[PDB]
Amino acid sequence: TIPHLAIDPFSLDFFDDPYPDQQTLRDAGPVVYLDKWNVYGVARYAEVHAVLNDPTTFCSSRGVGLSDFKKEKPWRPPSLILEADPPAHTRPRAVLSKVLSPATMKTIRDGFAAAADAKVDELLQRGCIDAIADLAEAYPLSVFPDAMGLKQEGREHLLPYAGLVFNAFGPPNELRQTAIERSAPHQAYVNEQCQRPNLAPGGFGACIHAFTDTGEITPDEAPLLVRSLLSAGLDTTVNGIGAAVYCLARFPGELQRLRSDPTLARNAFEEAVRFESPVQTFFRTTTREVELGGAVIGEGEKVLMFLGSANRDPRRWSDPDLYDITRKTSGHVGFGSGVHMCVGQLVARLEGEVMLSALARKVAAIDIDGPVKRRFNNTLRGLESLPVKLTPA
Ligand code: HEM
Ligand SMILES: O=C(O)c1ccc(F)cc1
Ligand SMILES: [Cl-]
């Protein structure tokens, strides 16, 4: 009753062009079985959304990667928020929510926006640039580590550590094995910067340590919550901003619409998150026998959610393969859905919005003028290099 597919959604060929295989997954049925890794898969919007919104049945405390924490030791101490279920999840979530709250965005917006404008001005002086290294990477690196309160020394560890983290959610393939093999120096840096004395005052990190006296978290919980922001807060935005630039580069009609109304910047980034889904996948583990779209999944089974596929499901979206900066994007799962829905989505949108705003006001055309190279990662979708010529407005 449940179709079995040999598709490896973590192979390089899949990363190179996932969309045909994603339609195959959606159309095979609401619940598939991936023989390659012995996990269930859900690729339609309806089933992804249902699984995300039943944390009791599809839990996260046994890991949101392939590995089942009840069977294997996690490669690092479990995340106190990502890899926790209610009620243990509730109070750590509340703290990060306040640390990254609407009121906090107001304190950093002017600095984030100034840095966004300043980078686009700098890029326009060079003309031909790499929209990944020189923009998608350089901008988040110029605002986020500082907003965290990190010292200058050792920041080169941040992107490699993040790549390690997202590769580690994947199966024990060469991408994962090789990342873990090189991890030691990056883990040492990150763990050390999570200690209270190493986080500058007023930053995200210090604000986390400052919440240890409310009874929501204890002092020994703060370092791991800082580790969460250093895991999830940088590499995701690099791929989100790179996706937006890529879309604008591929769809000049939409760059022209954005230039004509720069207040479309925030939705243009949201549509970019739906269209490329930088975070492609996450796992859950069944805590009991469950019926999901006619399939009977037993207890203790891994369920792979195709977030990027759900965001392109024609059962949910009109013209899903078209980048539309005026699309009503509410409901996309690029940030997840439910109790675990990205707690840092206000930071991501702020970064994305003020960068697209700078582009909308300062750039007339974005033309690819070099070989595009993809960056392969078991969980993240994005580009290694995106040579573009920026024409000033
Ligand atoms: C384009 C940018 C981003 C994308 C696409 C993204 C994606 C996601 C997704 C899909 C989840 C759900 C995980 C799950 O359901 O198991 C999530 C959770 C999370 N994100 Fe983001 N993220 C982004 C940026 C950020 C930023 C900027 C931060 C912090 C500054 C952050 C921190 C977190 C944390 C801590 C969680 C765990 C929340 C929880 O378990 O309750 N992310 N993110
Ligand atoms: O360490 C965490 O808590 C975390 C890591 C990755 C991610 F996408 C979200 C949260
Ligand atoms: Cl670590």
Side-chain angles (χ1 to χ4, degrees):
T1 290
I2 275 53
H4 285 236
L5 291 77
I7 294 174
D8 179 4
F10 303 99
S11 62
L12 273 35
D13 276 359
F14 187 95
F15 299 142
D16 179 80
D17 182 14
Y19 301 116
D21 288 346
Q22 292 179 347
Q23 168 167 14
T24 302
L25 297 168
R26 290 192 301 269
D27 289 358
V31 177
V32 306
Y33 198 81
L34 297 175
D35 289 330
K36 176 66 173 187
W37 303 111
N38 272 296
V39 306
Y40 292 82
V42 291
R44 302 178 182 175
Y45 181 89
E47 281 68 36
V48 167
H49 188 271
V51 167
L52 283 167
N53 283 98
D54 186 3
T56 303
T57 301
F58 307 89
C59 78
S60 300
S61 64
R62 288 170 69 167
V64 296
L66 168 64
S67 186
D68 182 351
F69 290 180
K70 190 181 170 191
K71 297 179 182 170
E72 288 172 296
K73 55 225 188 329
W75 72 275
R76 66 172 181 169
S79 169
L80 296 183
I81 173 174
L82 178 72
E83 292 152 345
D85 300 317
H89 164 267
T90 301
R91 275 187 283 177
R93 168 78 186 204
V95 169
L96 292 186
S97 191
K98 299 171 198 174
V99 170
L100 308 174
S101 67
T104 307
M105 302 304 101
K106 184 181 176 185
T107 64
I108 65 183
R109 182 176 175 99
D110 284 334
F112 276 52
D117 282 21
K119 175 62 66 184
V120 174
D121 285 337
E122 167 193 9
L123 296 184
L124 282 173
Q125 289 300 310
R126 299 178 43 187
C128 300
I129 58 87
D130 188 333
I132 301 311
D134 302 327
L135 196 167
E137 289 184 356
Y139 171 62
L141 276 175
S142 66
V143 286
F144 185 68
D146 286 324
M148 286 295 303
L150 298 174
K151 69 180 183 178
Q152 289 290 340
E153 185 198 357
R155 287 185 181 181
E156 68 275 7
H157 292 283
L158 291 170
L159 287 177
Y161 181 81
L164 157 72
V165 173
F166 281 98
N167 271 322
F169 296 122
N173 56 12
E174 227 163 292
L175 276 172
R176 187 177 190 278
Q177 295 204 0
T178 285
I180 289 181
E181 287 178 3
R182 310 166 178 173
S183 57
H186 310 318
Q187 303 186 200
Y189 161 88
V190 173
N191 291 325
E192 181 56 27
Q193 315 310 315
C194 298
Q195 292 292 324
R196 187 165 200 174
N198 301 328
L199 295 160
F204 294 158
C207 286
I208 294 171
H209 286 271
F211 268 98
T212 60
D213 47 24
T214 73
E216 291 170 289
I217 60 171
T218 55
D220 70 296
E221 296 184 88
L224 279 191
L225 289 180
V226 179
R227 190 195 72 179
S228 285
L229 302 199
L230 299 181
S231 302
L234 188 66
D235 219 1
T236 55
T237 64
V238 168
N239 288 326
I241 294 170
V245 176
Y246 198 24
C247 294
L248 295 170
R250 291 174 290 167
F251 300 79
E254 294 303 276
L255 171 62
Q256 296 167 14
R257 286 213 296 163
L258 171 63
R259 287 176 62 205
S260 75
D261 191 350
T263 71
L264 291 177
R266 197 166 172 97
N267 204 60
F269 176 78
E270 203 75 11
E271 170 75 340
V273 178
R274 176 203 73 84
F275 185 87
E276 290 301 330
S277 298
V279 181
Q280 286 271 300
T281 51
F282 266 124
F283 294 79
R284 302 290 197 255
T285 318
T286 55
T287 59
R288 63 159 173 98
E289 190 183 68
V290 56
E291 291 89 43
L292 179 67
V296 177
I297 306 170
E299 188 275 351
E301 300 283 356
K302 284 284 173 172
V303 178
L304 174 56
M305 303 176 300
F306 290 85
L307 302 184
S309 174
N311 288 335
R312 292 174 167 261
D313 185 358
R315 303 162 182 75
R316 169 65 177 79
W317 308 94
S318 174
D319 295 313
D321 296 332
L322 287 176
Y323 179 73
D324 181 6
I325 69 171
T326 52
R327 182 191 304 274
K328 294 164 188 169
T329 67
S330 64
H332 81 77
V333 293
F335 292 112
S337 176
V339 302
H340 287 285
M341 191 183 184
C342 178
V343 70
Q345 65 191 239
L346 300 188
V347 176
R349 289 172 181 148
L350 177 58
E351 293 190 19
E353 173 195 352
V354 299
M355 179 52 78
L356 297 200
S357 175
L359 293 173
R361 287 176 282 106
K362 302 172 173 296
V363 181
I366 304 170
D367 296 292
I368 299 177
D369 68 343
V372 182
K373 293 176 301 172
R374 180 154 302 276
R375 173 177 297 169
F376 298 123
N377 185 279
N378 281 328
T379 306
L380 297 170
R381 171 164 166 88
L383 295 182
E384 168 67 29
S385 189
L386 180 59
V388 301
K389 178 183 179 52
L390 303 188
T391 295

